[model samples]
Target: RRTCRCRFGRCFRRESYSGSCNINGRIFSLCCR
Candidate 1:
């Protein structure tokens, strides 16, 4: 949902305001601008 809303780029850790979602069953952080 949020992942698709923003760019789901690679991140070291999920930030407080950052969005997180799974890609292919793997967790990914959302890159919101």
Candidate 2:
């Protein structure tokens, strides 16, 4: 799940960190911050 979020969140989801529920916080931070 984590790997998937990191790999495809940008290409697949309209927003980064919005794909996998488990990685929303970290992914948001990584993308926005």
Candidate 3:
């Protein structure tokens, strides 16, 4: 399954979270399902 995208209130799914942010930031924070 693939989750579309999700980000903290300070961020967005595509603008600053989908690519590099997911790799460098959120990945270390949110749990993957």
Candidate 4:
């Protein structure tokens, strides 16, 4: 369990979503746990 870097909002667990992570473009649904 090691996740938390490219961040934004939700995705608290559930294999950490594993998708979405854009910067200025505005988009974030990624997390890796």
Q: Give the Cα lDDT of each candidate.
A: 0.49, 0.36, 0.37, 0.70
Candidate 3: worst 10 consecutive residues by lDDT?
12-21
Per-residue error at 22 for model 3, in Å? 15
| Model 3, position 23: C-alpha lDDT score | 57
Clashing pairs in 4: none
The residue-level lDDT of candidate 4 at 20 comes to 82
- Candidate 1 per-residue lDDT, tens place, 1-33, comes to 134333355543343335666678876665543
Q: Give me the displacement of residue 14 in model 2, in angstroms.
A: 6.1
Provide the clashing-pair count of each candidate structure: 0, 0, 0, 0
Best by lDDT: 4
- Model 1, residue 19: C-alpha shift (Å): 0.9
| Candidate 2, 1-33: lDDT as tens digits | 243333423453433443333354454222211
lDDT of 3 by residue, 1-33 (tens): 144344444443334333323554454223222
Q: Please give the lDDT score for candidate 3.
A: 0.37
Top-scoring candidate (TM-score): 1
- Higher lDDT: candidate 2 or 3? 3
Could you tell which candidate, 1 or 3, scores higher by TM-score?
1
**Which clashing pairs does model 1 show?**
none
Where is model 3 more than 4 Å wrong at Cα? 1-3, 10-33
> Runs in model 1 with CA error above 4 Å?
1-17
Clashing pairs in 2: none
RMSD of 4: 6.0
